[PDB]
Each structure stands twice: as C-alpha cells, then as structure tokens.
Design a protein around this ligand. Sequence first.
Ligand SMILES: NC(=O)C1=CN([C@@H]2O[C@H](COP(=O)(O)OP(=O)(O)OC[C@H]3O[C@@H](n4cnc5c(N)ncnc54)[C@H](OP(=O)(O)O)[C@@H]3O)[C@@H](O)[C@H]2O)C=CC1
Ligand code: SF4
Ligand code: SF4
Ligand code: SF4
Ligand code: SF4
Ligand SMILES: [Zn+2]
Lengths: 95, 114, 360, 38, 145, 291, 56, 206, 178, 43, 155, 144
Amino acid sequence: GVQVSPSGEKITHTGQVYDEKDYRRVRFVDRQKEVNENFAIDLIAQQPVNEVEHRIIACDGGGGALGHPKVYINLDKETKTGTCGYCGLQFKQHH
Amino acid sequence: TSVKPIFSRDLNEAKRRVRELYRAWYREVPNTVHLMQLDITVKQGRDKVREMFMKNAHVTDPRVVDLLVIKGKMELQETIKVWKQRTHVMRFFHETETPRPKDFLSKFYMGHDP
Amino acid sequence: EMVRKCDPHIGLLHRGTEKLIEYKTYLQALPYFDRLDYVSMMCNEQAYSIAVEKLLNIQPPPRAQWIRVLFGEITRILNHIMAVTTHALDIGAMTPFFWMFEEREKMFEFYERVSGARMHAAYIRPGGVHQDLPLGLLDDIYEFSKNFSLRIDEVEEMLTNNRIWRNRTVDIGVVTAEDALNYGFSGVMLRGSGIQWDLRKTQPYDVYDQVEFDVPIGSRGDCYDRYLCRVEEMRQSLRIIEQCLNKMPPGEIKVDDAKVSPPKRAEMKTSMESLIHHFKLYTEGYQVPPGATYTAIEAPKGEFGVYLVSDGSSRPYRCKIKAPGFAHLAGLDKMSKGHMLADVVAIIGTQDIVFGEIDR
Amino acid sequence: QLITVDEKLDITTLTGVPEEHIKTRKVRIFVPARNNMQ
Amino acid sequence: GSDRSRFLEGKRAVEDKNIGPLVKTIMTRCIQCTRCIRFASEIAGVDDLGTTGRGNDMQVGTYIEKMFMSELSGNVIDICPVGALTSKPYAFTARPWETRKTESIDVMDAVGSNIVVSTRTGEVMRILPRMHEDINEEWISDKTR
Amino acid sequence: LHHAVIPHGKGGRSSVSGVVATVFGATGFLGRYVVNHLGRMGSQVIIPYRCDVYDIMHLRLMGDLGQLTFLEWDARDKDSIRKAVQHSNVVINLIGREWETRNFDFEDVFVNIPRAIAQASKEAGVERFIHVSHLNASMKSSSKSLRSKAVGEKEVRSVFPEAIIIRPSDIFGREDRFLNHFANYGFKTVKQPVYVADVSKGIVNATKDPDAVGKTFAFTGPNRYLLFHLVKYIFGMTHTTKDKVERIHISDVMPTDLPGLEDLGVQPTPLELKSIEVLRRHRTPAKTVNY
Amino acid sequence: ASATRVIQKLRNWASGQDLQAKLQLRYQEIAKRTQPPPKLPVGPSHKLSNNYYCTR
Amino acid sequence: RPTVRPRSDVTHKQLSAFGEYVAEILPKYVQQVQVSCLDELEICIHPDGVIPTLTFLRDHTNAQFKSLADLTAVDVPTRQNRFEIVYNLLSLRFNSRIRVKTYADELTPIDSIVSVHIAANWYEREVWDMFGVFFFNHPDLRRILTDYGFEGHPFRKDFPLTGYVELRYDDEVKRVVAEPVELAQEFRKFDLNSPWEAFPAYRQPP
Amino acid sequence: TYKYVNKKEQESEVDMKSATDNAARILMWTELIRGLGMTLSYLFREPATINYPFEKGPLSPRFRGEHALRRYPSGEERCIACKLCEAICPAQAITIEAEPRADGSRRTTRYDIDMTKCIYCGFCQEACPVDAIVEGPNFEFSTETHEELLYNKEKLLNNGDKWEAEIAANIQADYLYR
Amino acid sequence: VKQDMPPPGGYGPIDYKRNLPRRGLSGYSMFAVGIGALIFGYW
Amino acid sequence: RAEYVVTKLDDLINWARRSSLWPMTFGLACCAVEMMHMAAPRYDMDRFGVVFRASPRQADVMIVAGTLTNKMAPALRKVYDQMPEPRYVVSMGSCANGGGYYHYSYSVVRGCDRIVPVDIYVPGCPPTAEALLYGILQLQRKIKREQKLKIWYRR
Amino acid sequence: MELVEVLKRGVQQVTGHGGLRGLLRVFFRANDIRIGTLVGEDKYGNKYYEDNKQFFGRHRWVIYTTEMNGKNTFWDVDGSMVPPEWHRWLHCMTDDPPTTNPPTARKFIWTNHKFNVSATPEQYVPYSTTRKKIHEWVPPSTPY
Ligand SMILES: NC(=O)C1=CN([C@@H]2O[C@H](COP(=O)(O)OP(=O)(O)OC[C@H]3O[C@@H](n4cnc5c(N)ncnc54)[C@H](OP(=O)(O)O)[C@@H]3O)[C@@H](O)[C@H]2O)C=CC1
Ligand code: SF4
Ligand code: SF4
Ligand code: SF4
Ligand code: SF4
Ligand SMILES: [Zn+2]
C-alpha cells in the first residue's frame, strides 16, 4: 500500500526512489526492491485519541517495564493535542 | 649532542657497515629469483635495490643509519630464506597501482590532493 | 630423521587487538578477551573485570563473585577437554573427542541459557555480571555434574594405562623445573614438573578462599604427568562445583552503583538518574582513574594476566594481554631436543596452543 | 664513548609512510575549544 | 549526583511554546536557571522571555505568543545547558560524540569571528562558536549559525 | 554528470570512476582482465552471464562489494540485451569464438549479435560502444572467421555511429588459446602479438578519454617476431580447425597510419619479457623483422 | 532407554560400572521449561536513608 | 564497607619498606620507587643499569623474582623518552610481585635480559616489531607479528588504526598484492572524553 | 593441598605373584582389551545425533542471533534514533542518520547493520532504552553474497514485522529478569 | 516472595575421584589357561 | 529425447557431487571450534556424507573459519589453487565475511571475499554449528540447481 | 521374550504412518520413522510431532509439507521455515506450543512466512536510504 514512481519503483517511508537517470537501479535487475508497506505515518492516524481526565498524566507503551519511559505531558492545548516522542499517541483533557 | 652511540661513530665509519649489506643483497637477487620463481630477470631487481639505497642517502645521523642497516638485515634474513613467498619479495615494486601524476595539472583531475 | 633445531613463525593470526582497544572503552572492549583463549572464554573476562575492579576499587557482590567462580571453573573443564582430546587427535585417538563433544555441548547450553549465546558470552563485565541466571539451570548442573565424573574416568579407563599412549608420551619433553621459571611457563607446564604453585591458593582473589580443593602437582616432568594433571584438574572442579553449588548466597548482581554497572532495565525507565547513567555508561562509560595493574589468573593455560593501563578518559591507554602460552611456545625449541617429529605434535598439545592468546 | 651531533633528528624513514603522508600533510596543533553547549 | 532518584511521587508538566522556526522549545525540562532571560536583557536588549509564575508551577516563556526572531536568538541554544530549547534544523540529525569537530572562521559578515564546525561522515550538521576574547566574544549571530 | 556517476575518489577498490559498463563475453580469457582493471579502480561493472555460475566465480572478486553484479540472458533473444543495458554509460563487446557450433557460427556471433547490442545501446542514451573486431580483417581474407567480422565493423556504423573499434593483433597471456596451442603438439608468417593487459589498460583507458569517439584502433605491440623463429623459441623456452589454422598463416600486416597504444596511455610490454610465466606450466631470444 | 535388560549387562560387563543410572544424555525430569517469573532481589542502597554516594 | 575492594593496609608497608630496601641498596640508576593504592610495586630506573637490578631480583634470597611474565612498551609521545618499557615479575617463594620499568627514545637501545630471563626471548622481539626499539645482545632479533613485508611499527601511537596498506588478489599476476588503503565505512573517531576531571587531588595544575 | 598425580614407584619386592602379573598385563594383552571393550559398549548405546532440519536442537529465549526492529502494538516504529546503539556497538557497525518524520515527530531516515560486522554481542538489544532493537532467534540467514547481509532497514523492519509473534513471548519471559 | 534461584539445603554428594574397577583376572589364569589350552592342541 | 534427459542427468551428476563432499576445514580462530561441535554427535557432519578431515589436495570444498590476516592469505590462496576445480567455498564467521571485528585493523583482511570467491557467506561471530549446518545445506542446493550440461547442449 | 517386545513395538513404527506411500515418503523425506503425537499441522503443512520418551533433541520433530509458495518442498527442505510461533516451541525454549497459547495479533504481522531466499529473485538488495543529502542546481532554458 505504497506510492510509486513514474519509472515504476517502490517508495519507502521516505521519498527515496532513484531518478530515471541513475545507474543504481541495476542492482534491482532480475531481483526486486525490498520494502515495508507499513508506513507508521499511515498507521498512527488510524488510532483514536485517548480522551482522559486530569490535564497531566503518564503514558506507557503497554507495560511499564516494557516500553515508553514514563514521560508526562501538559494537556492545556485545547486547540491541538499533546504527543509523546517515543510513541505517536495523542491525548485530550475531556473538559 | 653527547648522545649514546650504537654500533658506530660519526657517519663515515657507518658507511662501510652499509656496504656489508649491499654486499649481500647484490648477490641475493639471482638466488631468490631462481629458487622461488619470479618475473624479473635479475637486473630491474637490482635497480630496485639501489633505488632504495638512493632514497635514504639524505640521512646525516649515524644513529639512524646504524638502525636502517638492521631492518635491511631482517628483510635479508627473511629473503635469504624462504620465509617469504613470491608475493612478498615482489611487493616493493608497486607494479600494479598506477603512479599518480607528479606534476600539478593532472594531479587534480582526480583527487583533492594537495 | 631426528630433530635438533625448530623454529615457529608465530604471526599468522595477529590482529592488532592491543592497538584496537586503545580506541574503544572498557565496556566496549570486553568481548575481545573472549577471543584470546577462544576455547575458554569466561576466565579471560574473569581477569579483565578484575583489572578494572582493582582500579575502580570495588569488590563485586558475593552472588556475582560466586557465579564468576562457577563458570570460572567450567571454562577450566573446557580447555582440558579441548587439549586432552586434540592432543589425542593429532597423536591419533579420535574417539574420546566425540564422546566429550556431546558432553561439551551440554556445557555450552549452560552459557546459552545463562548468557545470550553459546560461546562468546559477554556475561562477565567489570561491575560483576550483567544478568542473573534462570530457574531451570541449577537443578540441571547437578544432574550433569553427577554424570560427568564418570565420563572422565570412563576415558581414563582407556588411555592412561594405554601403551600406545604411555610410551608415545612418557619421558617426552623433559622439562627442568628451574628452567621453566627462566622461561616463565607458570601454568600447568611447571606444576607438572613439581613446582608447587597455584594463584588460586597462593594469591587468592575471588571467593576461592572457602572451597576445600587441591592442586594436582606433577612430578617426573613429561607430557603424561602434565596429562594426569590436566585430567585431575577436571575432576577437582567437581569438588569445587559441589562446594560452589550448594551454598550460593541470594544477593545482587551488576554492582549496586549505577556508575559502574548499568541499572535494572525496569528502573532506568522511571527513575531518572538510572536513565542518565544508562545513557552515559553505554556511550562514555566508567571514567576510570589513571593507574596501572598487572593482574593474573591461572586459566587452563596458566598465568593469564593483563597489564591494563588507564587514563582519566573513559577509554584505556595500551592494555596488554599476558598470553601464558606465549612463553610456553618460546620453550618449544629447547624441550624438543633429542626428540623426533611425531611427539612434537604431542608437544603442541601439551603446551595448549589455543592460538588466539599466542597471536596478538 | 659518547658522540657529538646537533642535527634535526629525522625519523621519517623508520615508519613507512611512503611519500604522500610525509610532505603534503599539514598538522594542526591547538588547545581544543570549549564545547559551548557544556 | 547520586545513583538513585528516590523521587517516587509524580512529576509535573509544562506547555510547549511557538517562538519560531529557529528554536524548538521543550519547556517541560526547563530548570528555571535564568541563564536565558539574562541574555536578552544584557546581551541582546529585548526583555521578552520573562519568568511566569511561581513554585514548580512557574514556567519561563512569554506570557503571550511572540516570536523571538532577532539577531543572536540562536545563541540561546548554546546557553540553555539543558536541551529544553534547541535548534530546529539540528533537531535530531545527529548526536555530538559522532561529530568530528573542525575549528574555523566565520564569513558572511566582515567580523571574521571564529567557529567550531560539526561534521558527520564528510558532511555538515551544525555551526558552533569558539572563544576568542576579542572577536565576538563567545557566540555568533543567527545568520551564520 | 547526474550525481553519482562522478569519479570522486582516489585510487581504486572502493573508489568511483563513472565507468559503469557492460562487458559481455567476460567469462574466459580476455574480459576477466578487463574487469580486473575496471573493478580495481572503482567502476560498477555489470557482467551478463549465460553460463554456469561456477564458471564465473573468479569474477566475484576483483570487485569491491556492489561494483560487480550479474544477470542472465541469451543472445538469441531480443530485448534481454536491452534489459541488460538500460543503465549503461558504456558498453563493451568481447564476444567471439574460434569454432562454429550447431547453434552459432562465426557469422551469427561477431556480426548479428553486436548489431542488436549496437541498436540496443542507441535505444538508450548511451555514450560509448567499444567493440572488438580483430586486426587482419579488411575482407577477402583467406579464412571465413575474419571476413564476417569486418561486416560487423560495417554494420555497427550504420546502427551506432561514433563507436570505438579495437582491431588488435594476436593476443598472448596465461590460459590463452595461442601460446598454449603451440606448446601442446614455416616462413612467410610474421606476427607482432600484444600482451593482454596492454590491451586491457587501453580499453579501460579508452572508456574515459575525450577522443576515441569513433576512431578505429589497433593494438599491436613491439617485436614483430617471425613464426619459425618464434615457435622454436617457445620450444627453446619451454624446454584445431580450418578457420583457426587458416587464420595462423594469414597473419601479416604493416601499420599504415593507425593510432595504436602510446596515443592512448599505455607502454606496450614486449613478448620476451612476460613470456615465461605462461610457459612455466610446460617445464621440467628470438629474431625480429621490421619490414 | 530401550535397553532390553541384556545389553545393559553387555555394556557394564564390557565397560564396568552400572551406567544406566549415570548415562550419557538426558531424557526427562530436568528443566521443565517456562519456570515461573521471578521477582528478583534488590541490592543494597535501596534504603532511602544514610545512603549517599560518599559512603559508596 | 561493602563495595570498595578492601584496602588490606598491611602489605603496603611490606612493599613500601621493601621498596626502600631496593633503593638504598642500589642507589645507582634508581629513581622514585613508588606504590599505588593497589598494593603493587613500581621501580623506575635508568637504561644503563637494567641487568644488575634484574639479576638482583632473579638471584638474591630476599628478592626471589625468578619468573618473568611480560615485557611491554608503553607509548608517551609527548616526552623525550616516549617508550616506557615495563617488566613485571613474581616470587614463588615470597608470593608477591613487582614492576621494573624504564624509558627510551625511538633510538636509545636497551641491553637485553635473555642471559637472565630467557622468557623474554619473544617479548623483547615484539617490541622490536611493534615499536622499533632495538636491543643489544639479543639472539636472532626479527619480526614476529607483522607480515614479512610490513614496514612500520604499529602499536606506536603515530601509526593509524587501519595502517597504510590493504591486501587483495589482483588476478592479472596471480598473487596477493597490496595497494593503498581504501575503506568503505571510515572508522568514526568519537569525542568520548567529557569535561569534569572526575578525580580531584589526582590531577594536573597548570 | 598438593597431590602427586604419579607417585607409586616403590620397590615392593617384586615377586612372581605380581611381577608376572605385569607380564600378564603384557604378552597376554589385557589393558588393550580393557581399552577396546569399552568402545564396544557405545555402539550399543543411543547415538545423540539429530536429523537437523527435521530435528533442531535446544536454545533459550536469550539467544543472540539476527537483529530486528520491533514495533509498538499500534504501528509506530519503535526506534527513535538515540545514537547509542552504535556508540556502544564495538564493531562500529551502524549508521542511523535521522530527521523529523514530517509529522513533527522524531524517527529515522537511516538505519543499518553490516551483519558481517555485528558480532552479535547483545549490547544493542539491552542498551536500547525502548526495546526498539532486539536480537532474535534466526540463525538460518546465510546468503550467497556478502551484500545480502548488509541489512538496511526495510528488511530489518519487515523482519521485525515477522518474528514479533515470537519475540514478544521470549521477551515476555525475559522482562523482570535483566 | 523474592525467588531468583537459591537451592534447597542439600543436593547431596557426587563422586569426584577415580573409580577404575579392576576387572581382568590375576594372571595365572592367563598362562595356565592359555598354555593349558594350547597343549589341548598338541594332544 | 535429449534435453529432457540431460536435465535428469544433471540432477544425478550434481548428486554424487553433493551427497559426499570432502572439506578442508581450517582452524585459525574461535570460529574453528564450532565445526568440531558440528563434527560432534549432536549436529554431525558425517550423516550427510560429509567427511571430517580430508586432505586439501583431494578436497571438494573449503570451509574458512576465522579471521584472515594479511600474513596467512598467500598460504590460503596457495591452497585454493591446489584443490581441483569443482572447488566450492564456505566462509564461516563474521571475521571471514567482512572481518566483523577488526574490519579496521591493519594485519587483517576485510573479508575472505577480498581474496577468493565465495559460494556461501555465513553469519555469526560464533556461528552456531547448526547455523552453519543450514548454510552447508544451502550450498548443497546451490549446485543442485546449477546445470552444466543443460547449457553445454546449447554450446 | 524381551527381544520380541521390541518388535511388537518396532513394527507399528512402520505400520503407524497410514499406508506405505505415507510411510515410504517419510523415509526418503527425513529417514526418521518414529511414531509421534501430533499437536500442530500449521498453515501450509507443518505437523510438529512429539514424543517425550526419546532423548532431549528428538522429542520434537517437524515434517514439512510440499508446495510452499511455489518451491516444491519435497526434497529441498529448509530450517528457515517453521514460522515464528513453532520455532520457539521446537527449539525447546518453551513447553507450551502455539495452540493453547498462540501469539498475539498486532494487525501488522505478515500472514505468510517467506523462507531464506538464497539467490533467487524475491530477495534483498541494499540501498542508500539517505534522501541524496544535497541539491545541486538547474539551468534556465533561456539563452543569453
Ligand atoms: N584470445 C585471442 O586469442 C584473441 C581474441 N580476439 C577476440 O577477442 C574477443 C575475446 O574472445 P576470448 O575472450 O579471447 O575467447 P573466449 O573463449 O573467452 O570467448 C569470449 C566470450 O564470448 C562468449 N560467447 C561466444 N559466443 C557467444 C554467444 N553465441 N552468445 C553469448 N556469448 C558468447 C563466450 O561465452 P563462454 O564463456 O561460454 O565461451 C566467451 O565468454 C573475441 O572477439 C575474439 O575474437 C582477438 C584477437 C586474439
Ligand atoms: S536557559 Fe534553559 S533551563 Fe534555563 S530558564 Fe532558559 S529555557 Fe529554562
Ligand atoms: S535501536 Fe533503540 S537505542 Fe538505537 S536509535 Fe533505535 S530506539 Fe534508540
Ligand atoms: S549485537 Fe553487538 S556487535 Fe551486533 S549490532 Fe548489536 S551492539 Fe553491535
Ligand atoms: S567471528 Fe567471532 S568467533 Fe569467529 S573468529 Fe571472529 S571473533 Fe572468533
Ligand atoms: Zn507514549
């Protein structure tokens, strides 16, 4: 589920496909370009916002000994939301 | 400056100790090339040898020269015997790698090489 | 027909490890010491940690000291099995080799379960030990160790009264006692000629102080009395194991200080300070004091030791490894004098050329 | 015993370093800067 | 400092700001040091980055939404010893031990101030200043940063 | 040019030289040393193979970790050769054989196949089309092996003009078909052969020069030996079809104007100097003519 | 295992000691995989008082 | 106190007093016997008196140090005599160790100890291979660790990590030939040397 | 405690009772039988061989093998370009050049291993403060080319997009344990 | 609750010392058997 | 038919080839040791017709275990031009692949591939004996696929 | 008897694998006739038999099936197969197979394991995944 060059090659998470005038595409001849279709930027917007109570909380990555060191956030922005640089979750204040 | 001397005194006594070594390498180009086969006939092997002694003529210090004899004797002691191979003896020559332009004009068509 | 003068060409595997450590810090350089005595890993790490621990001035905790001795004399069992048998292969006996290398592969698994992998176990770090060892491990050593004092005497049935062994081996490479010290064998290759000596009892450092074990001296210097030393040193691990097994104290691992050991992975993840140290241990490291030591440890080879030299920068400054075989091999061309080819093979095995020590 | 000499004390022959990295190789001696972050 | 943070209660949080594209802000880790707000007031003459509030509840930054895009605004990054505020271009491109630092001179103004350049694998990631007591003094202007 | 064709990098073996190339017949004698003088200096040399993967292992080295790639094809297939050179600054054609098969003749191989490689190369935005016909090959030569080859020299220009052409004289090297022939068993047959690398360097040297954009070269070398003096000299040193043996006695030329080596960047090595190494596998100074 | 109560007497007569009890390899009653998860001990200086870095 | 490697004060005095025993008995060519907190002895001397202190230590009842363990060569390329060459011995009878180190330039050779300790037959030689420090009266000096055509002395701090040559097989000559050095990844020298001395009362004032 | 391995030579008045027992240990060979009849036992024992691809041997959940970049249970690549998973990598094996993600977030543009470097030492799986890099039970990833081991990142995700069914059970038995 | 792995008080003994069991008869029942069986040929 | 059968022959030509192959297992390093654990009972070689210690000059395959210095390399390649010329090659170890540790050192070669060809590269610092034993099988189908006469018929 | 009891036990070994095809297949396939209790039979046919009585390295053995993703896995049998839930059961890391305690779906894992592609197509090739790190110039097509 990726986007593709007009030359016909696969794009990564990053726009990375070689131009037409590029001898690098040789290495794909009689082979194929390995790529992960699981762009994080697509998966992450496909995740609902956790609309919690009090303005400040802790987050974790599903298991306190098992990811995402206990960073906090100030959820005063009613306009936007607050993120945690480890994960890509988002939060609101409920009020 | 009142240094400790080693194996000789002021240069012109160390210059015969040199010649004891050329006295061996000059007679051990033909023994190597036959015993362990090679490409050079005998001569350009001897040109290379003197081409190494006409690199270190710039020296002016007895201690340095009394040292450089030694490393020559080691390689001789490694060459007189078969401890080397056809790849070690024929390594000095720099046969393969292209010699870079010694001039200026061709020296920077490739390489940021001042 | 006969040998008089032999000359090795010890250079065929050098790598520049002593140089290559100078550009890497202590934690970043540990596993190079698994490589030297590639047969017996931990005992190298057992020394390298100490050369640090002296400078840093720390005794690691008992439970980590305690297990550091256990594997510290399972690695003893390895190299004997690797130079009892390979000393039999190149002499000719290929069978006990295979009888043991199932018994030896049951001895790697007890690294694989404990450490990450089988062989190059980066398990013994300067600050004690990285990681405790699991539940289904210590009920297993009992069964193994129980069945293992048989597997040896099972073999000693076969070889140590074997003509083809004995007269291939006896009177061979007669080493004079006071000449060994001139060469500094300082391992098996002198106790096998009656010089009563072992650092583990003559200069004890770890928890060896309470073990009640023995040193199998060899008289009548020859590579059969070296051999019997090499056998009985395998046996008298099991007295050490049984004593190193039935009184393990519950305690801590990876020394209490977070500056000399990484902290608990669940604890770096909430407690801030444990995070920072985790971010600087594994980038910068200990920041040793300047100083210098010459440690030592009798591995299967002998007095393996390190002349680690330090500086206030996190990285070392010309470590150096004392390869005990390095001196054993210099005596190769003096102990093979008035002896023919075929035993020179045996000389190699009864000098324990696990080259990686010899090579740098 | 001893010997007198006052010379430049060259060593460049005892290192390899064949021709390129002897002559055409400047060298900077300095006291490094304070990393202004820290 | 010690090994262990006996703190076990629960931290606080702080709002993030929108100064400008040069300077990111993570003011959840600001340490109330006052080493920034005394830069603008004594080296650049702005008086905008005040300290708002008291207690832990205090928080540096404007009371309002204003952009501190003036000369020498980038020197505030070298000053905040914490990585609270830092440079958006060198946001995450590298990490400092990875750098091979070369010391060189400013251009693009005729001052000829001095510089520490930060490389990474034959590339460039930052511009940083040296200390010469006569030229600039310790820092540089945002243009050549 | 683009961004990564650039020859920024010193020396070789991890460098770059913008000599991304497609040598076809480099599986036997000649092209392996070509790839050696390419792959050493840093040049992404493709090698199309149509043979055993084991017959190409000795090409895996002399190639620095990416600069040597491989892929499959067959000369009796349109557009595979095109696929092989969709990404080709340069093309090289070393194809050839000293004997006809049930499938391929002298005619099909030297002429019809380079014709398609020629057209194939021009259908992409290539620059150079280094071809290798052979010297002594105007037309009407006493054999058939050569009279076909010259047609390819005619039929390329009508496809891809401004193409380098090297018609060299006879080649000698280790594992050859020429000296080893004589070793393992006559006047008016005189021949100045050419060492291999002295051919290979020029080709590698010819794929970077500003000149050589259509000029037909001919690499000959010094020491125009006489056969009967030379064949015994081999015997003095060491101690089969129609169109090949017919090619032996044809060998007679003199250089009219042609460029040669020293106007390309080469010092030609004579025979006598590097002649023992190849005849060393058969163990226990000959007379020249200028004309 | 499948030792048919004769070869045991062939093994032992041919070798010696009763070695079905101290056999080479392992079958059972050992390392019953997935032992329970342990709550480790803690080291010292998790004591919250009289715990500086000066005394360590 | 648990985690400090207990000092064991007593043997400092043994190695200190014995450290004095060797000075006043041998005041020639002996400078600054010392000892670290780690109770291990160090004796700096002058190269002209190498053997007569070794032979005191191989041959004397109160210093039976008849077993050698190492002979290294430590670089300090900022002084004159950059190469600190180090000895280190052991008593089987007294159960202790020592360290007897010296100095040299790139050329101030040191007479060898092989008449005393033949254990140093090869330890001496690697230093010749690894630093280019000649020794007098050493039998059959020659390379050990380096190739038979390797110029240089690499454990010197002047010699780069990846040296000045890399080898390979150039098929045109059928040999393992050498040409200059051409990496693919460029070993990445880090600035892991933080500020903050970390060791006061242990440092260098200007 | 020092133990003489071989001290039995004592003149025991060697008589015909016993001195010929050595000659019974000789010409009528018995010690050789004793060394032979042993070996004959084993051929009637259970050979510990195993039919590898159909019978693979034992490991433990901490086996250091092939790397893989894990991922959170809700997409979202778990690696965040800390740049201490090379600063510790003694092989100097890694380059993890990075940027913002265009979401304002923080992730990579680059990640690397030369698996011909990468001693498989285990420093990176444990130094990673997030368990974003791990070192999983694959050890059948031998390839015919030195190039197919230079795992960049898309292989090393989609590898981590494969064994995550497995690693999250070994690690499930290895958290609260390191 | 803390259970990393201390053993139970025990784990018994284990042999450590050579236990070569002398089989093989005395030696008079070698020669007197052999020669006394050899001579069974010579009758 | 001709082409059908030669295909059915090459499946047999390359069978005797692979079903019993004679290595020249080098030592040189830690990496050496696992082959012996692969010569051991558990992951036995000999179950495949693979012989433990065969002479070099009659070998069919090489197995490079360990680091490869600039000193040993001629002593190595001298062997490779003494095998016959079905000689296949196997490079155990991260030190022979590209010099895993000591890539950057000076008495060391940055990959056995720098000197000799390679029919298979194998990872691991100590590649597990099994972790080779799949690779050795990967070799044992690297040539079950390759067809010598199938293409000679077209020659 | 004794001996015959083995053959009353060793005969179902042959006549316990269905017919003769089902038996003779196994023989040339793996040369392991051992009656095994089945627990598995994955997608694309991996059976994972078991018998606790044999020793520690043969109490679990897997019988691959033919017809992988177009490879004809009769002869050419790998170990890079055995996808990431039985691999952890087969190497004795754990006791419980992935039928009573399977792994946890995470809505991005693959649905079909791809084995160790050696030199075929559908394999890995390296990149330079760095976005070209420079931007040179463009001429204007407007002469002067
Ligand atoms: N070597 C000499 O004595 C001289 C040679 N030349 C010319 O040099 C060139 C090199 O020939 P050389 O390399 O010396 O001899 P080779 O035997 O090495 O043949 C060269 C290549 O041509 C390939 N080839 C031949 N026919 C076909 C075909 N129909 N389809 C695909 N590939 C094909 C062969 O493939 P395979 O590898 O399967 O054989 C071989 O690799 C030829 O043009 C020859 O005429 C000129 C003067 C002297
Ligand atoms: S300098 Fe940094 S830490 Fe100090 S007040 Fe300013 S933002 Fe906060
Ligand atoms: S692997 Fe771990 S430590 Fe390395 S950059 Fe990613 S998250 Fe950070
Ligand atoms: S396992 Fe060790 S050597 Fe391998 S990548 Fe991780 S840190 Fe580097
Ligand atoms: S790869 Fe690892 S095990 Fe193999 S030789 Fe190198 S360090 Fe030793
Ligand atoms: Zn989070």
